[PDB]
Design a protein around this ligand. Structure first.
Ligand SMILES: CC(=O)N1CCc2c(c(Nc3ccc(-c4cnn(C)c4)cc3F)nn2[C@H]2CCOC2)C1
Length: 114
């Protein structure tokens, strides 16, 4: 199957918006991590492939996904980066876990539809 850019946007953008709607849980994920602003200079030494909601949105808007699984992979990269970097007791880690639950719920019916 070949997927057209607007087909992917129409199907997948609502799943990304579902994450944005989580407040406060999406707040640490709405923009790229800025280690200087956040006072965490070790961030890029630990996280080699940063990813965040705004980058995923831009990739959908600019047709950079050819297959739905590539979008899923970027969302999961964002989650895995946060679980790797942040401590289990931290706000960002627990917020990540909530987003992962929401994403799992929203993405499945969409994948069944395509
Ligand atoms: C995604 C990721 O790995 N990050 C690396 C670590 C990090 C990140 C944010 N950002 C952030 C955190 C919390 C809130 C927030 C808003 N409302 N509430 C109740 C909480 C908003 C944010 F933008 N802080 N920290 C660290 C630095 C000091 O604090 C924890 C991003």
């Amino acid at each position: 199957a070949a997927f057209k850019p607007e087909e992917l946007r129409q199907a997948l953008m609502p799943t990304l918006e579902a994450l944005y709607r989580q407040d406060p849980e999406s707040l640490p994920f709405r923009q790229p991590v800025d280690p200087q602003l956040l006072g965490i200079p070790d961030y890029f030494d630990i996280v080699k492939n940063p990813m965040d909601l705004s980058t995923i949105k831009r990739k959908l808007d600019t047709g950079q996904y050819q297959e739905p699984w590539q979008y899923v992979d970027d969302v999961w990269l964002m989650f895995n980066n946060a679980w790797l970097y942040n401590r289990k007791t931290s706000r960002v880690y627990k917020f990540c876990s909530k987003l992962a639950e929401v994403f799992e719920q929203e993405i499945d019916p969409v994948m069944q539809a395509l």
